Amino acid sequence: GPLGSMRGQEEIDKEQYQVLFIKERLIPCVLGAVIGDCLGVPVEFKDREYLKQNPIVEMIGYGTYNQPKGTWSDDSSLTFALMESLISGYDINRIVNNMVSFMDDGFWTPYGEVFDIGSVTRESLNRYKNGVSVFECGGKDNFDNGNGAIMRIMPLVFYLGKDFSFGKKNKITEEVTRITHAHPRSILGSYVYIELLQNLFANMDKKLAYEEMQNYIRKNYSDYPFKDELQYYNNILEGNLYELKESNIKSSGYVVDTLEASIWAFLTTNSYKEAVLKAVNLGGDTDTIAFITGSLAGIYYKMEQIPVNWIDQIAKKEDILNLCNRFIESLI
Amino acid sequence: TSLEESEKWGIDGFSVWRNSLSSREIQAIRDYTDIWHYGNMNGYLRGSVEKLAPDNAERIKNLSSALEKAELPDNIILYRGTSSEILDNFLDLKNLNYQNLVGKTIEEKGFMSTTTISNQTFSGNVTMKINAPKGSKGAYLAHFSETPEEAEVLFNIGQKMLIKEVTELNGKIEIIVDLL
Ligand SMILES: Nc1ncnc2c1ncn2[C@@H]1O[C@H](COP(=O)(O)OP(=O)(O)OC[C@H]2O[C@H](O)[C@H](O)[C@@H]2O)[C@@H](O)[C@H]1O
Numbered sequence: 001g002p003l004g005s006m007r008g009q010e011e012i013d014k015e016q017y018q019v020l021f022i023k024e025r026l027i028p029c030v031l032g033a034v035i036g037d038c039l040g041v042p043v044e045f046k047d048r049e050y051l052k053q054n055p056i057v058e059m060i061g062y063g064t065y066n067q068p069k070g071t072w073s074d075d076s077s078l079t080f081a082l083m084e085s086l087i088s089g090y091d092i093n094r095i096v097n098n099m100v101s102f103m104d105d106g107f108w109t110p111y112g113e114v115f116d117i118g119s120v121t122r123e124s125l126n127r128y129k130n131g132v133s134v135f136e137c138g139g140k141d142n143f144d145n146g147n148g149a150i151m152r153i154m155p156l157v158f159y160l161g162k163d164f165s166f167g168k169k170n171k172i173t174e175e176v177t178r179i180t181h182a183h184p185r186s187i188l189g190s191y192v193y194i195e196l197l198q199n200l201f202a203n204m205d206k207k208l209a210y211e212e213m214q215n216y217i218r219k220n221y222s223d224y225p226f227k228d229e230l231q232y233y234n235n236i237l238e239g240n241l242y243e244l245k246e247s248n249i250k251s252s253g254y255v256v257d258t259l260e261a262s263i264w265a266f267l268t269t270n271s272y273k274e275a276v277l278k279a280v281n282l283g284g285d286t287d288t289i290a291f292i293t294g295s296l297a298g299i300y301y302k303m304e305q306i307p308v309n310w311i312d313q314i315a316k317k318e319d320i321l322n323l324c325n326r327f328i329e330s331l332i
Numbered sequence: 333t334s335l336e337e338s339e340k341w342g343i344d345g346f347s348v349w350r351n352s353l354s355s356r357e358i359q360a361i362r363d364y365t366d367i368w369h370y371g372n373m374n375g376y377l378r379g380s381v382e383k384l385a386p387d388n389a390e391r392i393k394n395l396s397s398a399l400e401k402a403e404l405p406d407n408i409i410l411y412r413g414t415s416s417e418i419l420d421n422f423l424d425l426k427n428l429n430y431q432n433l434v435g436k437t438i439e440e441k442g443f444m445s446t447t448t449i450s451n452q453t454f455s456g457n458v459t460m461k462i463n464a465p466k467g468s469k470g471a472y473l474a475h476f477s478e479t480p481e482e483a484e485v486l487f488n489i490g491q492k493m494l495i496k497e498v499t500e501l502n503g504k505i506e507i508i509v510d511l512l
């Protein structure tokens with residue numbers, strides 16, 4: 001009819017505008033997280049009081065782990081390993097395979113060497129190598145509740161895309177978390193983080209994104225095995241985290257401390273740079289708290305707020321951008 | 333409104349324009365009707381494709397040169413089928429409120445295809461009704477595609493459309509816009 005050759009254009013338009021929508025969110029989320037990792041690596045385990053006297057304002061080098069400026073750690077490596085696995089579709093056995101390649105062979109490390117990996121993560125992957133199934137190899141002890149799963153699951157939000165329903169999200173977030181962190185307290189943490197990041201992906205203002213996450217988690221995760229774990233999340237899930245003072249914020253690798261700190265850093269600041277520097281200068285698990293904060297601030301404030309000075313110092317920047325573009329292509 | 337009225341409008345307003353196009357301008361218009369060329373040209377202009385190939389650069393240059401010589405001879409209402417993906421930056425994707433699009437301006441960085449004929453079922457979940465003013469940088473295209481009946485008005489890059497009203501029914505969105 002009179003529409004003629006124009007009829008075909010709509011499917012191409014849909015694809016192209018989906019590329020743009022994803023790219024606008026994915027690239028600053030990844031770069032924002034990676035930069036936080038880079039900022040915090042050289043001060044990991046340093047105390048908050050030392051950082052008050054010597055605050056991070058820029059990328060520094062040759063501190064903890066004795067690495068160059070712009071060196072990212074296992075947080076970024078395992079995130080990249082998940083993006084790589086997802087390009088050909090969700091498959092839990094390809095996901096754990098890529099994590100073992102990071103550990104054993106330095107897959108997606110900055111200079112080919114694993115200079116850091118968490119203990120729960122290492123112990124869990126070693127169990128998988130020995131025949132423990134991917135549904136049983138993760139650490140279940142009360143002191144296995146580190147932050148090593150929340151630091152590596154942000155690509156799941158992009159994989160879900162505009163599927164905002166419960167079922168698939170609920171399944172894959174648990175499955176991917178449980179590879180290393182199988183305690184229900186840690187799994188609940190993953191649902192908290194995914195929900196907040198998804199709400200920011202969906203264009204909610206940050207306070208609404210936070211408030212909607214609180215209602216969602218209480219609605220869906222008040223039955224066993226999570227009912228008894230909600231109490232540990234009371235500062236996040238009840239009241240306003242952004243009313244807490246720095247002196248009330250703990251910045252250890254505990255999954256609760258880390259989520260409190262990173263979400264607080266995001267909600268109490270008004271730019272990307274302010275957020276990630278606030279996170280890093282809490283001391284403690286500085287690379288991971290800043291990576292998580294940077295994922296949240298990155299997707300929210302987007303590329304215009306990510307300093308080019310910092311992007312250009314990231315190790316393997318061009319390879320990371322290539323991986324981002326390959327991941328985006330696979331989501332179309 | 334009628335195809336006959338659309339064809340007369342095209343002849344009266346664009347016969348001079350068309351008979352004054354260079355061969356390379358004509359080929360670029362024909363190329364644009366190929367969905368493969370369409371994707372490469374609009375992908376680059378929109379930013380979905382980062383690398384600018386010289387040959388794509390030339391096709392875009394020749395199509396834009398063609399349309400820069402054209403202007404709508406009067407005010408007309410045109411139609412476009414599209415996807416809600418063009419509105420995703422303007423919406424809370426978990427709390428969709430299409431009425432809040434009223435007053436927002438859509439920008440098409442690429443070339444924008446429209447039809448003069450409303451009595452068609454468009455592909456996709458957004459239909460746009462475009463009030464296009466006289467003097468707008470668009471051209472009626474007759475005999476350029478392999479579909480003889482095609483009634484196309486093709487606009488040069490960078491059109492902007494102000495959303496005036498929205499109707500929604502079963503996920504199908506109708507949008508009335510003013511071409512700026
Ligand atoms: N219930 C708990 N209460 C308090 N602290 C806890 C609890 N459970 C765990 N922790 C603390 O949680 C921490 C877990 O540390 P690690 O096991 O090395 O890491 P990962 O596998 O979790 O993840 C990778 C991490 O290691 C890399 O450096 C990455 O950058 C991340 O920082 C310990 O200090 C525990 O005391």
Ligand SMILES: [Mg+2]
Nearest residue numbers: 073074075287
């Ligand atoms: Mg680390």
Ligand SMILES: [Mg+2]
Nearest residue numbers: 285286287288
């Ligand atoms: Mg760390």
